[PDB]
Amino acid sequence: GVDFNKNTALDKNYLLNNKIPSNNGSKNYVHYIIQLQGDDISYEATCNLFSKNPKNSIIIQRNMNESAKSYFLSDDGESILELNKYRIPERLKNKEKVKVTFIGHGKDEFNTSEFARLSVDSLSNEISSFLDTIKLDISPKNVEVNLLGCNMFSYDFNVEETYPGKLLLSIMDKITSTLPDVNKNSITIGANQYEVRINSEGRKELLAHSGKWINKEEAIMSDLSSKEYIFFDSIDNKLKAKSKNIPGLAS
Numbered sequence: 001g002v003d004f005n006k007n008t009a010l011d012k013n014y015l016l017n018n019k020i021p022s023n024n025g026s027k028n029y030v031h032y033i034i035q036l037q038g039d040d041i042s043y044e045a046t047c048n049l050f051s052k053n054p055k056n057s058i059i060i061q062r063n064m065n066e067s068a069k070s071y072f073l074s075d076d077g078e079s080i081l082e083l084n085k086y087r088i089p090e091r092l093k094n095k096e097k098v099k100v101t102f103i104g105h106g107k108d109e110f111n112t113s114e115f116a117r118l119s120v121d122s123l124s125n126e127i128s129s130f131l132d133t134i135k136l137d138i139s140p141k142n143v144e145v146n147l148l149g150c151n152m153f154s155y156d157f158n159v160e161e162t163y164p165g166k167l168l169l170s171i172m173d174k175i176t177s178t179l180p181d182v183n184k185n186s187i188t189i190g191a192n193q194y195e196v197r198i199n200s201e202g203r204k205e206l207l208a209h210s211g212k213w214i215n216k217e218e219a220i221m222s223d224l225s226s227k228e229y230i231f232f233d234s235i236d237n238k239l240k241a242k243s244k245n246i247p248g249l250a251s
């Protein structure tokens, strides 16, 4: 019954008066939060995630297409302001890292072909447009492209056959070409092995084997990895993967 074409427009007062007060450590990054699909679950996740760290984050409802724009918090915290799609305010242009999270649905099962119903080629092409735009504002040293959505990584396949591995090979030269202070060893793709969601406070939870949804701290105690990093190692020119949070787990 999910309507992926609902396309609820961002309510600025919802963020300022409800979500920021409810949900809001200097991160060294600008966080671009890109809502790819028009369902209300994606919309709420985008709002909630932004509202937890509103000063360094940007919302883009990419599902709005020609009407997509950057939304972000004013310097004084009293307003949600706007710029053209993927642009950022002056105060964020000196950050040395970019985190770009694509909010999407994965599938009921692991898959290697699509994220948010987008092929590697399709998402790569959008990332190319994104990179050509953010270079007008920022020249970081580090980039993470974070795929927030279920079942997009498995250690049972070669990293190069997985969607994040394929995506990294597809985009890495565009990243280093456009963002000249980013080298290959400073690009990572974030991906999930398990189902994930953003809770009503803007925190990521993972669906454990028990059927319980668990937060960051509980996942670590449970020895369950909520996010993998996929990266390219120039030393042997191979794609690799490792767990972000679980010291032992790697490709």
Ligand SMILES: O=P(O)(O)O[C@H]1[C@H](OP(=O)(O)O)[C@@H](OP(=O)(O)O)[C@H](OP(=O)(O)O)[C@@H](OP(=O)(O)O)[C@H]1OP(=O)(O)O
Residues within 6 Å of the ligand: 025, 027, 049, 052, 099, 146, 190, 202, 203, 204, 205, 216, 227, 244
């Ligand atoms: O800084 P990142 O590498 O992008 O990771 C952040 C970071 O987690 P850790 O530094 O503990 O690994 C945030 O923690 P803080 O900076 O706020 O201390 C946490 O947000 P929470 O405070 O809510 O735990 C967030 O998690 P979330 O996805 O819930 O925004 C998580 O990002 P990742 O989940 O993508 O690793």
